[PDB]
Amino acid sequence: PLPPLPRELREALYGHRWDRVIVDVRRTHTPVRGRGKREEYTAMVATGNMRGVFGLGIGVAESAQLATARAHLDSLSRLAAVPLYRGHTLYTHVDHTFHRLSIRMMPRPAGWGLRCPDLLYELCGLVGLRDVSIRVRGQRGSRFFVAQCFQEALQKQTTPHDGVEATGMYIREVFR
Amino acid sequence: RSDPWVAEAARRLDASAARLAALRELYEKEVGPGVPLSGAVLAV
Amino acid sequence: SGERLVVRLPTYPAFEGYPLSELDKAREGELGALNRLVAARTAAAQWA
Amino acid sequence: DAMAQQYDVPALVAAHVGLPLSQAAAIRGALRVKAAEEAGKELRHVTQLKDWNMMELLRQRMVERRAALEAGGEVAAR
Fold first, then answer.
1. H or E segment at C22?
2. How far apart, in whole angstroms, are the C-alpha atoms of residue A30 and residue B24?
3. 18-77 in D: which are within 8 Å (CB) of C?
4. Closest-CA residue of chain C to A89
5. Fewer CB within 10 Å: C terminus or N terminus of chain C?
6. Across chain D, which distance is largest between two alpha carbons, in Å?
7. Cβ–Cβ of C10/A173 closer than 8 Å?
8. What are the S5 DRBM domain coordinates in residue numbering (chain A) (predicted)?
9. What does the alpha-carbon distance between residue A128 and residue A146 come to, in Å, rounded to a whole number?
10. A139: nearest Cα among A86, A100, A83, A97
């Protein structure tokens, strides 16, 4: 089989910096009419550029290298952009729930460090979150749902630069 | 014919009108000629 | 050459507001101005 | 919460709306401007928040600002 790569993505791999993280690789099972038990390796690859554009890719195949390569290229096909404060923290408090998992995410002032669970440490270093305290609640037994949940939870927040043109009201003085 | 409800309800209407004239003149002596916007505005 | 450069104890994104003609009035936003002024104050104190 | 903090009184908070950050920025900025106009007045004599439509005032600021800039002049040299 052959995985796809476009033309205009080939200004980006020559463009931004990039890092790659496999989320988890999982072996599923199916007993099938005719020959027996067919398995697929499902692989989940995250890819960011450490400046606030994040990507996820889920891939399914028969063997582990081909599965991780498919999810590797699927993530690099699928990128979404996430606003940060100066590349280290998120704008608001963030709460979200994918499948039924209660993530709770807070901003922290820069130089707090990442106080953060296992895979989400590489995830926040991937997209570029240097200073965030998180906790995940509910059944945390799946890596895939915390990855997808984290992508949507990043996409939830609100940006202040879409106001100053049209609110008549200037937005500055960040002194605590 | 004046059924008794008509007479009593007339008396209650004029009693309410005399009341409203009385507390309106209480507001007139307390405030003066003014819109009932607020008394907190007229406290100056 | 020599100078002190200190990044401010770097904070949350803020509750953040000012009236509109102050954009034309004020020149630099307060994070840069606080960086320069806090650099000067901490430089003098730590020199003493 | 904004005039609760800038007049420094405890306030019986009721609920918390979710909002764009630019909006909540605009509320607290305009209430700081209101405290600049209502400076030193006695606290019950403050024009209360029902009495003051914020959006119409900011619309007036927008209208007179675009009027002053359109009839700017140095704008031609710029």
1. helix C22-25
2. 86
3. 21, 24-30, 32-33, 61, 65
4. C12
5. N
6. 54
7. no
8. 18-82
9. 17
10. A100
Give a three-class secondary structure readout of chain B. CCCHHHHHHHHHHHHHHHHHHHHHHHHHHHHCCCCCCCHHHHCC
CA A93 to chain centre: 17
Q: What does this entry list as its resolution, in Å?
A: 4.2
Q: Around D52, how many Cα atoms within 13 Å sit in the side-chain half-sphere?
A: 13
Judged by phi (left if over 0) then psi (alpha if -120 to 50, else beta), residue A168 lies in left
Instruction: State which amino acid sits at residue A32.
Output: V
A74 phi and psi angles, rounded to 5 deg: -70, -40
Amino acid at residue number B29? K
d(CA D51, CA B40) in angstroms, rounded, equals: 12
Rounded distance between C-alpha atoms, residue C6 and residue B38, angstroms: 54
Sequence-distant (≥ 6) Cβ neighbours of residue A85 within 8 angstroms:
A91, A107, C12, C13
The rounded distance, in Å, linking the Cα atoms of A65 and B11 is 97
Q: Can you read off the two tokens belonging to residue A21? A: 């993280």
What is the number of CB-based contacts under 8 A between chain A and chain D?
36
What Å distances lie between residue C45 and A70, C8, C39, C41, CA to CA? 59, 16, 10, 6
Residue A171 CA neighbour count, 13 Å, CB half: 20
User: What are the Cα distances from residue A142, in Å, to A99, A150, A170, B36, D9?
Assistant: 10, 13, 44, 65, 47
